[PDB]
Write a protein that binds this ligand. Structure first.
Ligand SMILES: O=C1C[C@@H](c2ccc(O)cc2)Oc2cc(O)cc(O)c21
Length: 212
């Protein structure tokens, strides 16, 4: 009973398979991100977080039997999701047109803040973030265009860009850095991620799967 989610006409299939790793994932949750301008929420993109199918078995031990309300208030739960021994696939699909530099600027800002926050922002991470930036420079995201973050548990962040919502066959870059690899997802569902839409989806959707 793992359904699909549609955000501003941008649909997120309940399941997807990576053309890069062959692994299959289930939709953990989908929401929206944008900017608050003059007290008004201006939507810029849709975001969906996919978890490798094996995430269920991994999370089962500690979080089966827990209620959605309980999971939602438990930071540890989200930590297991963020740093769990399974691949996470994040798909951002634009609502409003953003260039690669424009979009990446905010993402990188949050990633850097997180990294410095937890004391893991050294030269290696800075270089990884520059490589991150470089990968986005030649890209533009018109409405519907997407960015795919493949978070490998092996400490690598794969970056893919699509003209639309379809997963590209090949990745544009590989950011090989452990800290940075989870930084993106951390800024989406981590403790210091204000927006709760993705967290709420995860808390609401996981219990059913964890129970069976
Ligand atoms: O999906 C987005 C939107 C992005 C963004 C919003 C508005 C804008 O004008 C440019 C970029 O900021 C982010 C920053 C993050 O840490 C994680 C995210 O998932 C995102």
């Amino acid at each position: 009973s793992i359904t699909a989610i549609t955000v501003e006409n941008l649909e997120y299939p309940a399941v997807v398979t990576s053309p890069v790793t062959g692994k299959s994932y289930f939709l953990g949750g989908a929401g929206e991100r944008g900017l608050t301008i003059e007290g008004n929420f201006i939507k810029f993109t849709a975001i969906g977080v996919y978890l490798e199918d094996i995430a269920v078995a991994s999370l089962a031990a500690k979080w089966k039997g827990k209620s959605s309300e309980e999971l939602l208030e438990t930071l540890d739960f989200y930590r297991d999701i963020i740093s769990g021994p399974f691949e996470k696939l994040i798909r951002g699909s634009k609502i409003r047109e953003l260039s690669g530099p424009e979009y990446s600027r905010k993402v990188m800002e949050n990633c850097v803040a997180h990294l410095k926050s937890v004391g893991t922002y050294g030269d290696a991470e800075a270089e990884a973030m520059q490589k991150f930036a470089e990968a986005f420079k030649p890209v533009n995201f018109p409405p519907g265009a997407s960015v795919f973050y493949r978070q490998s548990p092996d400490g690598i962040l794969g970056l893919s860009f699509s003209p639309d919502t379809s997963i590209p066959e090949k990745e544009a870059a590989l950011i090989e850095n452990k800290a940075v690899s989870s930084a993106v997802l951390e800024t989406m569902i981590g403790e210091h991620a204000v927006s709760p839409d993705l967290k709420r989806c995860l808390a609401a959707r996981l219990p059913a799967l964890l129970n069976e």
